[PDB]
Amino acid sequence: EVETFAFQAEIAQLMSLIINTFYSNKEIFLRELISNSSDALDKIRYESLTDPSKLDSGKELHINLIPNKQDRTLTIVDTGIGMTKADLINNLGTIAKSGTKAFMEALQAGADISMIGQFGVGFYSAYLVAEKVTVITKHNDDEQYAWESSAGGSFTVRTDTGEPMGRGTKVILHLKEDQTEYLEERRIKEIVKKHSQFIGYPITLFVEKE
Ligand SMILES: CSc1nc(N)nc(-c2c(Cl)cc3c4c(cccc24)COC3)n1
Ligand SMILES: [Mg+2]
């Protein structure tokens, strides 16, 4: 069963701004997704201090970067807190706790897209480089779900089976044809060193088999 939802208007407008604004410094998407992963890891780390059983789904707190040139995807995986179905719909489909409104106003008053992470919406910078984003997530309190959107004002949510994660979130970027530089090992290493060198969890960049 696949459920289809409309983004809240302001989120659809934010997405359109990211997709349509001329902006060359696209590499910042990776820092933004790694920052979200680090925050999700801080959350499970903290919750586990008072409830160690929350790590029964995996004790290791880490981030993996997985390029795949055959599929033209870059995947950012973490073992963070993850999202229940409701968290997934609220966090990715609505303004919720984000600074969506403040960011859109800021862009009209001198700010630029690289500042997106100051407004709680850095995830949407994935649309600088991806034509489609799939988010697979597993929270201790729920089953595994897959969210997906190619923008255009809608997204889908369905249960995900056959490839269970212990806990965390996987952001799969289906790259635009002209954005394949983000699959190259030297490019990913350069961006991690420039923007994510102080993250407090291991970031492992996978090597390609062929
Ligand atoms: C809550 S667990 C989590 N893990 C990771 N890696 N990312 C997110 C996350 C995603 Cl996937 C997307 C959005 C988020 C927002 C806030 C906080 C976390 C997230 C709002 O923009 C969408 N949440
Ligand atoms: Mg802020």
CATH code of residue 60:
3.30.565.10
d(CA 86, CA 114): 29
Residue type, position 95, single letter: I
CB of 169 closer than 8 Å to CB of 34: no
Distances (CA, A) of 124 to 10, 56, 117, 204: 12, 31, 10, 23
Q: Read off the DSSP letter of residue 161.
A: -
CA atoms within 13 A on the CB side of 52: 0
- Tell me the two tokens of residue 69: 């040139």
State the residue range of the domain holding 60.
1-210
Domain count, the chain: 1
Resolution (A): 1.4
Experimental approach was: X-ray
Alpha helix ranges (H) inside the chain? 9-20, 28-50, 85-93, 100-108, 185-195
Closest CA to 167 of 54, 74, 86: 54
**Nearest ligand, CA 173:** 1
Total residues found in the chain within this entry: 210
Distance of CA 13 to the CA centre of its chain: 18
The pick from 34, 78, 91 for probing ligand 1's pocket by mutation, whose C-beta has the most ligand atoms within 8 angstroms, reads: 91
From the CB of 169, is ligand 1 less than 6 Å away?
Answer: yes
For residue 92, which atom of ligand 1 is closest to its CA? Answer: 22
